[PDB]
């Protein structure tokens, strides 16, 4: 009787696919995909409101106490623990100008900024609060040189010679 | 005082994270004209739940604020609820809608 009319369509589709696959040889820039390979990257990718509430509480504590370097350090830690480091660097630069003569805030601002900015931050912290052993140690640690660290150690010995 | 109900004591640690745990549910309410004060003491966990935003605490405080007026007699209830917290006054005014007889007026003076 009436045979499977879909057989002709299947044969035509197979012929078209074979012709396309053969023509694919001439495609020099032919490229493929790896969903199965990506599957390993998706399985390896496995690691909100409370973090936003903590960030809002840190912002309210910084607005209620601008001269609190524990509040500025907590705001910098909350901004650097999640999201981007630019907001943490801006908060550290705001806390260094709002609460001067603080060793912990200057240490957090030196740890949050890059070294080209950390050198200027350590220079500003030495100009605002000199004879600091932690600021001098952070400046000698962010020098990446022998002569620069020797000059920083000589400046720390000339400023505060009673530091072990 | 809306902040008193939402006030959370924060721990201090050099390396450990600060424990900004809630203190209590009392709003430090006062009424000098009434010759007394109101202490709406609530559990700290009840005052501020886990991952509870400030807006969520304000919404829950409004329900408790209306509850205190509901428990009190209409005559004994404050005829004018003068709260300096203008932002929190509107939910209190919205809560005050449950009591049409009572009125809510902004408090320029802050206790």
């Amino acid at each position: 009787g009436e045979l499977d009319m879909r057989k002709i369509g299947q044969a035509r589709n197979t012929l078209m696919d074979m012709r396309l696959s053969q023509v694919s040889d001439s495609v020099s820039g032919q490229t493929v995909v790896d969903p199965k390979g990506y599957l390993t990257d998706l399985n390896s990718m496995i690691p909100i409101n409370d973090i936003k509430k903590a960030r809002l509480l840190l912002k309210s504590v910084r607005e209620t106490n601008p001269h609190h370097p524990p509040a500025w350090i907590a705001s910098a830690r909350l901004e650097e623990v999640t999201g981007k480091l630019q907001v943490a660097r801006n908060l550290i630069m705001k806390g260094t100008e709002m609460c001067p003569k603080s060793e912990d805030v200057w240490l957090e601002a030196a740890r949050l900024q890059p070294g080209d900015t950390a050198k200027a931050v350590v220079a500003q912290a030495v100009r605002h609060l000199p004879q600091s052993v932690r600021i001098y140690i952070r400046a000698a640690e962010l020098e990446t040189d022998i002569r620069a660290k020797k000059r920083v150690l000589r400046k720390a010995l000339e400023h505060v010679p009673n530091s072990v | 005082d809306d902040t008193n109900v939402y006030r959370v004591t924060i721990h201090k640690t050099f390396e450990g994270n600060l424990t900004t745990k809630p203190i209590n549910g009392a709003i430090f309410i006062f009424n000098p004209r009434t010759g007394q004060l109101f202490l709406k003491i609530i559990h700290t966990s009840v005052w501020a739940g886990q991952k509870r935003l400030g807006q969520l605490a304000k919404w829950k405080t409004a329900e408790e604020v209306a509850a205190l007026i509901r428990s009190l007699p209409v005559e004994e209830q404050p005829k004018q609820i003068i709260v300096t917290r203008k932002g929190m006054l509107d939910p209190l005014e919205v809560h005050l809608l449950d009591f049409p007889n009572i009125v809510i007026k902004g408090s320029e003076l802050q206790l």
């Binding site: 509430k53 809002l56 509480l57 840190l58 912002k59 309210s60 504590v61 607005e63 209620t64 106490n65 524990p70 509040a71 907590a74 | 809306d2 902040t3 008193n4 939402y6 006030r7 959370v8 004591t9 924060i10 721990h11 201090k12 600060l18 900004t20 809630p22 203190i23 209590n24 935003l53 400030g54 807006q55 605490a57 304000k58 932002g87 929190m88």
Partner: peptide, 29 residues
């Protein structure tokens, strides 16, 4: 983060979000 319960100020919803530049500067990143 002092031991005072009020040490951390209450976080009231604000900084109204909006395609409006409050700072009034045309951003160019």
């Amino acid at each position: 983060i002092d031991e005072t319960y009020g040490v951390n100020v209450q976080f009231e919803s604000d900084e109204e979000e909006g395609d409006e530049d409050v700072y009034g500067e045309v951003r160019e990143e």
